[PDB]
Amino acid sequence: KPVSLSYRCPCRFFESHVARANVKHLKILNTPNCALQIVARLKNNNRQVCIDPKLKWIQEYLEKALN
């Protein structure tokens, strides 16, 4: 419908600087054309952002959340 932005990955920019502290909630988007893009919602900013999978606090979360 558009051109190359819809079914593809929904995340574009990742806020690795984020930290579980200022993070309000966590969410994920199950896409086929892409992988599991973990989304989120920051507090200090009060907005939704894509968190990095290699984060220090998310590495523990993804560890228990995955397995």
Largest CA distance in the chain: 39
- Output the six-digit token pair for 2: 């558009």
Where residue 59 sits, what CATH number does that domain have?
2.40.50.40
Paired residues of 50 in beta bridges: 14, 39
d(CA 63, CA 43): 23
Paired residues of 28 in beta bridges: 38
Task: Please enumerate, by residue number, every residue annotated as part of a binding site.
Answer: 20-30, 41, 48, 64
Task: Please enumerate, by residue number, every residue annotated as part of a binding site for heparin.
Answer: 20-30, 41, 48, 64
According to the entry, how was the structure determined?
A: NMR
d(CA 43, CA 49): 11
Place of tokens 């190359």: 4
Domain that holds residue 53: 1-67
Total domain count for the chain?
Answer: 1
